[PDB]
């Protein structure tokens, strides 16, 4: 399946487009919301954001909705990322 590359302040993450599509209304899952961050030169989306937090952000999609705060990430910092990426908890 088609893959997508997400560059977080230099740290590259790669996942299948269908993995993100599993949550169509989140920022990364909505084509219109993530469009603004696409880099045509490298074929990847770029976010000048916190690196440690993204592992949990990607795990959210890969796990089907589990939102776990990484041990090394402060509570206030993680909440800001959840808000930016527009992640929901309610199942």
């Amino acid at each position: 399946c088609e893959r997508v590359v997400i560059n977080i302040s230099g740290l590259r993450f790669e996942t299948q487009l269908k993995t993100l599509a599993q949550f169509p209304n989140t920022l990364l899952g909505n084509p219109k919301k993530r469009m603004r961050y696409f880099d045509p030169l490298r074929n990847e989306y770029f976010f000048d954001r916190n690196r440690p937090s993204f592992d949990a952000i990607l795990y959210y999609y890969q796990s089907g909705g589990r939102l776990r705060r990484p041990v090394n990430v402060p509570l206030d910092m993680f909440s800001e990322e959840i808000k930016f990426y527009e992640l929901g908890e309610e199942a």
């Binding site: 088609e2 469009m35 045509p40």
Partner: protein
Amino acid sequence: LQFYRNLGKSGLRVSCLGLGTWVTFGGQITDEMAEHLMTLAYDNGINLFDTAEVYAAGKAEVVLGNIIKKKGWRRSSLVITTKIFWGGKAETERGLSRKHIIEGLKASLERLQLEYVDVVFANRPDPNTPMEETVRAMTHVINQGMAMYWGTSRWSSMEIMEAYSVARQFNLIPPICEQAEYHMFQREKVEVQLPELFHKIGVGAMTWSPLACGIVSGKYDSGIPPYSRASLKGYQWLKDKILSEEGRRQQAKLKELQAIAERLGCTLPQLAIAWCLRNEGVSSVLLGASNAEQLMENIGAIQVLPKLSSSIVHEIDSILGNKPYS
């Protein structure tokens, strides 16, 4: 409003209208008519001319090349495009393999009497050749100076993005344009899918069959006119479409459009073509003509453009009933 514009986000500047050679050049019309048509187009500012290895089994390319050399126009003032896919009866004379892209283009350039084309297009997708191979071949002929840019034709958005992805993957050259059918009865791809690729990866849209092979001209109202494309030999497929149930429903809608045309003081063909250029998403529209009368009328479409108000456009969507959902 802007006669010349960039083809997609590339640096290549084309006229909003172009002149194609399918059916006519080396086929339906005479070399004398061909020369006359191309001369009128050129003097009227058109710098874009399209052809393909398959048209009239290569003859279309020969005639185009002869006119260019006969007229002596500066090569740098012309944007010549050709398509590759069907180039012979042998098993290896078709497709998008490295072998045929190279042999096919080389043969077209020979027939055209040209050192290179400005844009070489894959005339359609090739299920038998790996994308990587096709992209490496297009990049190769460009690096060999046989073409300035390359594009796709009849490819899905997914296929185009894949070409782009493979190019970035191996640092080759992405395609800059998709040649897609666009007219009042074929709208989805150009209006909903291509714009996304334009903003995202800069691929432009060059459209063809603005009159749906002439159907949108309104001349098939009462039937198939003598000497019309639908009357030509080898085009029974077009005759069947026009006379079919679907074909008749289209003609019925054209009668309503004809009323809008008369209201605006233009002809149906001019309305249809201006309609195609109403949105910036389209870089250029490839015209087709068998008479000089047709061509000049068609070019007159540019004047009709400013009349296509938002009310007129909505009026046309109401009669067509086929506005695509984005």
